[PDB]
């Protein structure tokens, strides 16, 4: 049995970090080897980049030609760029199918996109002194980059998409926590907090993988690997594979990009509470190891998950707390990443890319610093 699971991917500005670099990594996802209803990609932007989020669209639009390519054919990597880059053996068969018409059609189409995202930040560059209007005429919100309502916008997913074979991709969340003069954010640590909430009233997903916007899943069936290894008990803390792949076994321990935890370990118990006002989020914080309540209706948890990126849903709220993703006081210490505890039966899943001290840091080179 396979359970859901919700991997992150943030970002905080598009002209320090190439959106085709963040492009990849997110088809990488979109085209992972995984049930579509149990998987879901939530990109943050911080910077509230109407670049990011149209290349996030174009992107979203593109992965609905690529997806089905890459799954017909077992393309691997999932991210063009570097497929595209692989070597490839012509001279193996002596008749052409239809990769032959199909590799050299998604070529076209990848080189089609980069175009198209090139134009995007062509025009990212030359700041309009009167903000930014999208292409369908409407304003961004975002124009103000400290002061602005929270966005969320769900691509592909049950309600929109459809590869072009006629079957639904993974949702793909835009979202982008609300910024108001006088709320210290906490930057990327702010984003991660509020991004496990917002994932959580929508797609509760039993298990989370944040991942860095240019660590491409380079392994289609990564997630397969990941659950059947990730539930039943043995003895022994590490073990290694054959960059590679680690997984743990049996205080608390800090882990980043890169790794599949649990959820219900961010949260002290085990699936009064101040994880917020947010009654919503408090009851998937209480139900099983993931899923959203059938008593939900879609217009009260959109209602929420704006609700749970508001300014100031973190205040006095513990959060940045005891648990969860922790932050250092003022003039930033490092005493950074996810949170669990004393654990009793827990285990993650993790592929990268003195005696005591030496094996620390190799152990935390595993968990993404």
């Known amino acids: 049995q396979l359970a859901a699971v919700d991997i992150f991917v943030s970002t905080v ?30 990109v943050s932007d911080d910077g509230a980049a109407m670049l990011s989020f149209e290349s996030l669209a174009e992107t979203s639009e593109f992965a609905r030609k690529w997806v089905p390519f890459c799954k017909k054919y077992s393309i691997e990597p999932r991210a063009p760029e570097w497929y595209f880059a692989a070597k490839i053996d012509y001279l193996k068969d002596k008749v052409q199918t239809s990769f032959v018409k199909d590799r050299r059609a998604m070529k076209r189409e990848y080189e089609e996109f980069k175009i198209r995202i090139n134009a995007l930040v ?9 903000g930014w209007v999208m292409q369908d005429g409407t304003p961004w919100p975002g124009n103000n980059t400290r002061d602005h309502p929270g966005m969320i916008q769900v691509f592909l997913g049950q309600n929109g998409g459809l590869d072009a074979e006629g079957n639904e991709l993974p949702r793909l969340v835009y979202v982008s926590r609300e910024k108001r003069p006088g709320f210290q954010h906490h930057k990327k640590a702010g984003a991660m907090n509020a991004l496990v909430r917002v994932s959580a009233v929508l797609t509760n997903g039993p298990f989370i993988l944040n991942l ?15 659950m059947c290894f990730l539930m039943d008990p043995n003895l022994g803390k590490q073990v290694c594979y054959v960059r590679n792949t680690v997984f743990f076994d049996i205080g608390p321990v800090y882990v980043g990009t890169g790794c599949v935890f649990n959820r219900t370990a961010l949260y002290g118990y085990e699936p009064e509470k101040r994880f917020g006002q947010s009654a919503v989020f408090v009851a998937s914080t209480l139900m099983e190891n993931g899923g959203v309540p059938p008593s939900a209706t879609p217009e009260n948890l959109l209602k929420e998950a704006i609700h749970v990126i508001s300014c100031g849903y973190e205040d006095k709220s513990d959060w940045g707390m005891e648990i969860g993703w922790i932050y250092g006081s003022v003039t930033e210490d490092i005493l950074t990443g996810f949170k669990m505890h004393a654990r009793g039966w827990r285990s993650i899943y993790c592929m ?9 840091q190799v152990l935390r080179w595993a968990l993404g610093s």
């Open 13 to 42: 500005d598009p002209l320090k970090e190439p959106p085709l670099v963040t492009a990849n990594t997110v088809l990488s996802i979109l085209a992972v080897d995984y049930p579509v209803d149990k998987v879901s990609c939530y």
């Open 122 to 130: 062509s025009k990212a560059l030359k700041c309009p002194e009167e």
């Open 212 to 226: 860095d916007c240019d660590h491409y899943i380079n392994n289609s069936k990564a997630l397969r690997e990941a």
């Open 352 to 360: 990268p890319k003195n005696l005591s001290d030496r094996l620390n």
